[model samples]
Target: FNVSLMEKLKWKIKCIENKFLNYRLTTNETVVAETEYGKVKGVKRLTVYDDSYYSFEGIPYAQPPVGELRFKAPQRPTPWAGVRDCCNHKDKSVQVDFITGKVCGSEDCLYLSVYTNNLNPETKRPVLVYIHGGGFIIGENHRDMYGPDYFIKKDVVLINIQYRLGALGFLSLNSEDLNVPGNAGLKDQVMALRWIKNNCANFGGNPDNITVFGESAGAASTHYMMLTEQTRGLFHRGILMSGNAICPWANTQCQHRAFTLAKLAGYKGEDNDKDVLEFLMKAKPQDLIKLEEKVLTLEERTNKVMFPFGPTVEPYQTADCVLPKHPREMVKTAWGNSIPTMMGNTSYEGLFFTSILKQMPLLVKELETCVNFVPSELADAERTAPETLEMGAKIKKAHVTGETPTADNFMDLCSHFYFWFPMHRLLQLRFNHTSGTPVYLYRFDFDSEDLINPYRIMRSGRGVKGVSHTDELTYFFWNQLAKRMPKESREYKTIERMTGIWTQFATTGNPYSNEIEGMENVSWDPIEKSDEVYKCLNISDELKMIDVPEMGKIKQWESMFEKHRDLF
Candidate 1:
């Protein structure tokens, strides 16, 4: 024992002295990418999952939208002379803090990242383009936030995309001017897609096999893009997680909210179109962000529309708008190009939102009054008709089983109103209208018990048998604090299933895709055209496919949808 200990100690000391394996980014030859602009040199990096890929971070696909470019659509990037270094992630879009509402980041932030393992000019790999979601206001293309460790192992090129947000992104004066329009944020994404289509081949991604996927507002943006004719042939596949365009408040609640940005920036006019435009154009982006924070904070505390700046119907007769038609109407007719899609939402989308309702104990005083207190935006974006308000009553009855507010029940009501119903109707519309496109729907039920919620956000007790807004994100991403979990751990295995399924879908139209991991046993089918009951992959604690008991839940929403056809 003593001899072995001595030997081990000596080995440890020797290892420490020569610790080359401890860490070093053993950089390979600088990988050159011939972007439409010019050549960019990327670095070879090792991921925990494996060290077989190259990382090309912070490639400016578009010229920085500064000065005169503020509210305008992103312009083409300037061609570079020398090799541009793409070894690091660049600036994040300007955003106010989610909880504190403080302004941060920069105006010059439109950038994207690419991770690739196959650079053979002959070999073509599917490209997975990810759009980060922050309600069209506050998200990033940061390395830590959107690491490609999980994806690179699956052998595909992954792209993380960032776009403008808040007033700089989605402000609509509802003005008659085509020059000052909404959906600049959406247009930013479109330009990025164009860039990816043009340059993805250089990064070993197939120009023909592009799939765009996102969660929350990013998903909504994806749906909006799916509706817009401008995005035709840009991407062949889509994965929308937890958000869609018809979510009642997908459009702005009030253009008057646009004036609030102006008021903070010294424009005191009655908040007209030209004046609002002038104020926003000159106002410090950070100042408008501050006003955005205040407005969003107030809306959140009072149970109002969460994202004031979001995709809107650009009512311009001009063809320049990214999304020209109302999404609710557009889905009834077309899907940019009838391509394959994979969409899902969690078991409990609004469990984190319960923390918001718990703040006001007075909110529980009366059932009759609390019914009306549900944000009008929940029922309709413009004005809640009495019929829609009555529809809200039916929804309230579905939740408050005991007819009084408790922390336990608040989330269920919020979840159904905000997340579940909107996605449900989206699937319904897709199934009813489209024939050629196969839309796969699933409900993610794999919430682990060891989840470490950062805030009291998703914290819950016994009765809650579900996951919150971004619980599924952990299965695909690495947190700054996330350690490498053992393969034996449920978290690791679940992620093994998730990342494999996602990347496989990227590879082919099929999501169940594998000859291993028990995936071959299940045949994942798309929602057949307008079938009252269609099959969905029940991605629960254990992976299985099940016929969802849609009758009871579908009827509940059907009553509401039947009552107010236009609001949906």
Candidate 2:
């Protein structure tokens, strides 16, 4: 088996080189690809037992979003005069600070990589277009953790896309600006889908059966996509992981803090808006990084300045748009009324951020100190009353219990208020709106304990106990940089089972059937109502459907969130 694997790897390398070097314009039915860009060649890389043949690593679906087009919505890629070389990957987009120093990626990064088994126009395979998550700041299509190789092996065509990030993607001027900005990254994703629809047949993909899937920010973008009438027919299905539609604004107080930063940066008035934007566009990347560092390092007693760039409601586009009146209104109305969507969150989603905080011990104290920096809403409450000891007690209680009142509670409260509770609310809203499209919700409980060493300790102890915020990534795509290993060994059958279930959902709207080993009889229950049974993804393969009200002390905690739904 080792020899066979080595031989296959060698063959793939040879095929890659042949496809790159000895490329030819072939008119033959089986060998040629007549793309919208122009005529191109084809080469088969791997063939699985199901008779599905895969072509690994295709080209960009649109032109690079760089230079003057940096912050603008994506434009169509100009048609190439001849066959364009797509044998290799383009440079990745500039990434956000991720512990390590900046990884080199180009600004010209609006590219996509495709994996498909069919090239025949007659045989149309279901397509899955994936958007990667990096907190709306980092990540790209070429991340080894999100490759389409595994999905293609299952006879599905997968397309992974890259969009602009950070200031280039999400900085918004005042509401009066002529430009309908804010969701540039989102607009880029829509353009990629449009390109796929117009040209997917060239690569054997069905334009009609596309499903958009994403995790975290990508999932949030997918939610936004569902709310937009412009994006309606671009896809038939959606898969949201750990994020949902109601995630735009958690607290209006936080919004004012961001507005303050923009003002300090001289992004004021309609006259100066374009100049401020141009300055940011051409700002040295390194200086921008330092400015971010300064913002994070500010000795404030509040959490307002941690991440300034996130999604916001574009007021100009909202009136006539299909979105739910406003972002907050959308959470209440539109999220659950869209196309069939399968959504879930990692059990330890907050644990990932907590682990990061633990690593930088200073962050713990800084976070506590920064609470005082919170805007007037909660800040006024902390300032006027009680003794210093009483205030300290208030802060500590809020921190440990995740309650409101104290400014320090903002961090933990934001976790639930911003991400978890919003997702749960969106799920319930969708379920209540219509049973026509089932909303299957599950909590990923699997932990990667085997990957962490007990003896070798880090500042955060042992990272996290259960599925961390990007843990599902390893199971979806093979990656060496990932903390967890792929499910290649016999001992990790559960991982394989989870991946199969996810892929099944991607292919078909329903992620049902017990055909996958260890996942049998464990179908996910629909979140139809508040009193209905909710399935707890258990330790083993079995799913235990328990009443939502009976889930121990956590139910009490969850109930607190329900009471404060107005805060969201």
Candidate 3:
């Protein structure tokens, strides 16, 4: 259903009211607002598109997770007196930089940033909360990478959340006694959502209408929030781009890394969980990140489970538990289908695997053999099983047809297995639930020539094509590496269409419920179990819904999963 002119008039009046409030509340170039905790002063700035928006940076949602709180869930932030100045992004969680290889960030990194065009409480625009993606190990919630320039143009409020990363965020001793069951990073997201729910109305957002969207690890984190009961009423809609809870690397259990890190940190004491926790608490943060490199096995790295520390199935189902069971089991009860959902992957997510492939030719050789190419979700005891080996051979035969896997062939294999296939399974699970609510899907196929594709820019003259991981971000955000596009350019039009569809969904739970600018002809229909073939929107210079791409390859993996149901 398209929005009526009456609705548009109402929205325009709301904007006018909000502008009046902004004028009334403005003090110099900063705006002061009252949150539930206390008063905060945010700066007013013009977006690259020449639209005025307010930015509230480095607002603490949780207490610093240092000292005894290092490995535990986040606690509510303490309130402060007087108007607190929110002017800069705080420290990102501790992790090694992907580019410079330097250990950056700090342990005290539980903060979030907000961008909005309105200050009137009655404006009540839709809220968009973003969780950054960095393989659950690294990434920051800052304007440079996840800028709000594009989103602020739309009549919605955008919030960027930062959580603990690496070992500090995900180290799991799996001990109920020690009170460290893991997934503190995920819990941090929940805490941020709680904070947003309590305070978004103060920033002219609808508390009941919230959407949580993310890419890669952040996407998987969003999916986990969908599945877990801990986040039941925290958010209303979800947009998962290029990741899900069931991805092999997203929630794999590898608790051995805790011990491995302990050894790396020079722990000669007895092998005890409590002792390890105590020792790690006092260990140098720099050493913790530096030694994280040595903990990954060659196979794990090649398989793209690069981070040894990530979300885990909590051993104890205590009151504070986040992910108590495997995602597959929790899908039946997931509240996601009842709410609107939009999820999809890039045309070539495999480009992200280039770094490891180049660093370790051994990994490429191992990938060529396809002996251990089986999904890591396979039970450890069943990894060497004859059936699993045969399945791996079949997968390799289906995906890597050449005598040896070329870079493209290997990349496609990585794209399908690591990203596309798992996301497909998640879709099937959600759709099979047969709820009446809509589940929109998309495939980002536009490989732009003008705006710098992240993979293309970093490839540095190396031949690569098709939209890769993190490329779509360039369209939705005005990042430093890839700035704004010309208003007349296709890149800018893509930005307009992308943000339109996203904000439309956040407003109406349907991507095409309203006519978006430059996308009037497009009608992105949701998947129906009644359909003969799964359909999704194809986002490119031309926008339309088509049968999902690579159905033949998807069927192969479907068969593999169906056969291994007992093992899985």
Candidate 4:
């Protein structure tokens, strides 16, 4: 039956069940399930079949971290006196206005959703907790991008969490001003995992066999969890997609920006820190949103800043709290590191941010500004050096061939600074800290016909690049848009293969086996040395390990940065 027809039938069944049996039937009756948190209702969103698992949705792991507790760490949800109805989704977190008719958002946004197949007591299913990515600014578990009905069918229990976003989540302060400072969002994630470990067994999950996975900002959070002493033993494995432990942009520099913004928002007094924090907690939600909007508008007008809030390594905060030191230092010192990890990125991850880059028109002028704008001596060295400038030009030319340094070049350069270089640095840190832990690397190369079209326009017909950021998400989730395309085409097969590999990896640390054709007996190896070696996931689905020269150039650029670290 078609999804709409099936959905209607399931709704009718649920209505009948609610009216007569006093029980709830999910949109998909065969996948009925319940959790300690509450009963959930879900449809068999994926066509793939495996009856060993049942699916649940809209389960609350913590009380909504809203209102007076807006910027605080997540607290335990008060136990409901009776069965709490969790068949529907709660409001999502407040985000910058982007689309019309979307729910505006509220502080009450700490609910979680789950999908599980091993509902039977005899089975102890492995748990995989997913944290969605939106640059720590926007995203919710409700987005179908993370639907786990397919994995549930594979006998895996999937948990997707929702945390505070933007200023509401990452607001940091001095200890004198606040109870917990820095990384409130990180704390929220930890609390959610703690709740899962405590309550997952009731829903047929093996907490000990947990794996934390995320992409982009979510991946960065996973890496932070690895460093945090508070998150120890929370999950046994991690899958970091396109993000790592250290990014030059992810340090104190970003934190200072957040602090400055807070001060500007009327957070004042003799104890400016305390007064500012108090104001933030008591500020009208709408007023605080306006403050955020003003900050964004100012940044847009000046074109000096990109993201306002981010994670930082505060002294005695995330500093001494490190179990094995920072991931960067851990790589250098070869510290205690023994977690199996899978890390990768799309080949042209920068393309997604092209939208932001196109807004700035002074491309070469901006590069000139970058030389002086770089606070680090290392940045100065690279910026002032003629060779570095030429190399930057080559990189620009590679992405925007024959195109003048217009808005497109500006956007591409910004993307590299903000995202691309950071990603590479993270991978390098991971490889350096390889203390017997396997490090699998991949570069998604599937270029979507739809994505490629806009990208060509953005780059002025430079080249049909490989996969862009978030493009892999469509294939991995087997999203509705993907299915609307031809089912018998190679893309469909690629989607199936990609989904199978991801599910298999979630099930076991290794994303290989002969369970599916074209992916049978494939052994995904870790990056032992940097020589442009990458596992490319494209049309044919064959592993072509080749030397990526661009990566080598990035390494050279990074070394220059290291030599002049004091300047930045």
Candidate 5:
């Protein structure tokens, strides 16, 4: 809570006028919410350094998928007629701006944004939804990137959303109703979590207390909505920081390229699925996201469409499916997959994809990563079965023997092959098949903060490392919107003890709370299983728990996710 960019521009103009000027300041301290599709008007936010909330921005919760609701599955909002001011964030969804390739938002963009610090319409809180990671093709649930500034000083009520990105929400057309199946952007974030489980109790919250969460492809679409079965129990808890959903740019099999993104938007055939929905209902969201950089350089020509589109493997469920299995056969033909998760990863989470291949010199000299880029991304989804250069010289004889490949060892071999051994083999597939939940793991490796941090704004004068890939989002975010951390810095006591251990694990799935007094000397525990009862939490600036090292070159990608009759 350290201020002074002239005290955070007078605490962001009394944080945007006590929460949002007008409504007749008695300043008539007004704020309102009511929606089955109407009445929004919000703003009234007080904060010495967090809490005293009521700020709503762009709250549409569906129905603007636009033009026969483009790529379908997201209907609900359509009723407004009176007082729809929901105070401007403008619009989002429909993206393509990974650091200015340009395009940007609006197909009316199915919106969402709510932050309430108790208006107590019968106190039932805990609803911290989030979901913004650009590798699901350029992200945003925008408010110049997340708010309720320091999470409404935690009694929890924050819902920052907006789905559908790149190639009109995860382009696929492997087929499921007119060239669209690929998770119409994780079904527009489960229809904005069924419109915040039927309107987060008219803005007070508690649609049976959610947690959801994100980072990196919004933690692989919140780990495929924590192994989605229509977001079972619509979220109880889950916080995956460095993505999952078998991370290949967050769930993909690739190349149906929506009938060549519908004949490069001219639409003249090789089409089916109702002639590619009559040219994606006259496609032109900047000529289909600028032909998704010419269909990812005509499908990954040594990877450079710099993130085209993602979220796939639905291909068959009537009425526009939402990732029905293929998060590696849904963690081996699944089981009752319980939730209470709290995943992690950072010690260089694949140096932001080999810091964009340091200007390609033979993929910067054979970028060795996850058993050789999983046989060229599963031989471009033609799916593989063979491998024997003595199984790629015994996987370059244990994790690319000889770290000659450097994006700084291609970001610790793509942060231990695309996110710490496929998110610890999905916590060893929920500790050998479900039930008895509570799994928590970590490894951040705190980078010493000094302003422009998120690791020295992606440091170039480098041989990388100091907490890579979005270095723990500047410890629970406030990455400068004026200035932050100064209620006496230790980076504002490690971002208020990491936003009070992430809003007390969004109201107790237990990330332990005593609401930030050096945070219960970091106890945490629960990883549940095998040798040294598996633990992780390494965090930094404070928080330790350690011991997750069986280092056979970091547990050799467990036989690159099983199966292969030995070739060496």
Candidate 6:
């Protein structure tokens, strides 16, 4: 016993000395991984699930889009020889903060964050690349909102990428001389996808089994990716959450917004795209972003054209063009119709509109006129047209409760016209043309009493009803704004169910392949075009299949579509 105690004491002393020497002499080389650009050192992080994962944050996917490169397509990142530190979040693209009403982020913002549980290249786990949503105007790949904690626990690789937003990303001159025929933001995604395809394997991800997914405008971006030839072979599947290509709020012709910004800047130059571009380039980024609200007319605002900057249909059909034709025309082609897709909206997508509507009482009072709230697309930008005004009044009369209209009464209208109708139209188109792969639809109705909804968190106070838009994010990600659910709670189980469903889709192109843990008995069948009434999975306190989710809303919108056949 005495001899063993002496040996133990010596061994302990030796270990302490060696540990001190190692700490002083050795750098943290264990977490380093090789990439096409250079080796990057990542940090080991703890997931909310009590396990750990490796995070390589803020890796440059493209060269900085600054100086002359502003409003241009992304270029390949410059290669480096030595190991680069990728352990922190990088700058997001410059844009106005919706809550703060101030400019934040940098013009040189094209970075991506990769998270995984395995680093062995042979592991080859399914990869889920996420693009964020803030109407294509705000938002970034910050861990504060889109943490990899939930996804890492699901045993899949998660990547979050950032791109340009607002005028910097979407402003288009459509001029060959300027060489700036828009969709720079979309091209930014393509470039990041290319980089991901080439380097994801180094982080133990399967390049051949990648799923591209996004929310809101990010979902619209994912739909854009499916239709574009530029993103071919970069991803195997897609999941669109609460937005799509055909949404009325997306793909507006907004070259006039650029000229409006120039005028707002007090530009005294000739009234042409060339001079406007030159003059606008010289202004500060903050100055450029502050004028974003001024780009819209009162009619546009009343029509709820909330996001002025987004993907546009390019005029030139060259090699660089991501959107060669309109989304309606592109969906008919074989480009993306064959890919397996899963898409859905939340229970209360209209709740998102309340954030803006409550702040602008003038707009709310204008909304009472009813005609002003009519979609400019359906009326061809003629808000005062007698026929259009009549249709608008008809819609208002059907939805409103009291003599005057409030944001509460208008919720259903926004939900139907802006989100539900557009998703239904895309579903019909995709189902009609789908070559082989299955199409799946869902309605995210799960609301937690424990965790506050994202929309309500953004709005700061809550009188909003139902599961507001973006509430589903609480389960898929571990955001800074919300508290983590207890391990034994139903909220935690919901997170497990959600991440499991998402990763299962990424793994096999089917969301419910072999039943996820909490969702064992639920049967999810793909939508069949032959079926008279389409089916959707209703996800709430319980998971079950329902006929078309909300048929009453569908029929009401369908009747309106039939009545205005020409405008539709």
Point to the candidate with the largest TM-score: 3
Candidate order (lDDT)? 3, 6, 1, 5, 4, 2
Q: Write the per-residue lDDT of candidate 6 for residues 1-568, one digit (tens) a residue.
A: 0123443454456446544532342334348889999999887776444666788888999999888888888899998998898877798888875444468899989999999877774568998999988888888887766878788886788999998898899988867788788889999999999999999888888889999999888898999989888887678899999888888876777766778888887889777989999988888887888788678886666566766666888767666789877787777673677888898888877777665665665545654656755556566466767777666766676557688877776776777777787887776667657776888888998876577533454543354457767878888876655555787787887888888889888889888845665466667888887765767778887887787655565555555556555434
Candidate 2 vs candidate 3: the lDDT winner is 3
- True-vs-predicted CA distance for residue 336, candidate 3, Å: 2.3
Candidate 2 TM-score, true structure as reference: 0.75
* Residue-by-residue lDDT tens digits, candidate 4, 373-470: 23232333335577455544545543443434454445455445555566666565556455667666666667656412212322333354546666
**lDDT by residue (tens digit), candidate 2, 136-250:** 7777765334544345546567788887766556556653553535666667777777777777766778788788888877887777777665575678788888776565332
482-556: candidate 1 lDDT, tens digit per residue: 456777888888778888888878778778766537565688888765576757787865767877643355457
What is residue 108's positional error in candidate 5, in angstroms? 6.4
Error of 6 at 260 (Å): 1.0
Per-candidate Cα lDDT values, in order, are 0.71, 0.55, 0.79, 0.57, 0.65, 0.77
Candidate 6: list runs displaced more than 4 Å.
1-30, 361-375, 401-406, 460-465, 563-568
lDDT of 5 at 170: 69
Q: What is the lDDT of residue 491 in candidate 2?
A: 23
Q: What is the lDDT for 450 in model 3?
A: 65
Tens-place lDDT per residue, model 3, 353-416, is 6655665566556455455566765524435677667667667776776688776667777787
Cα deviation of 434, candidate 5, in Å: 39
Candidate number with greatest lDDT: 3
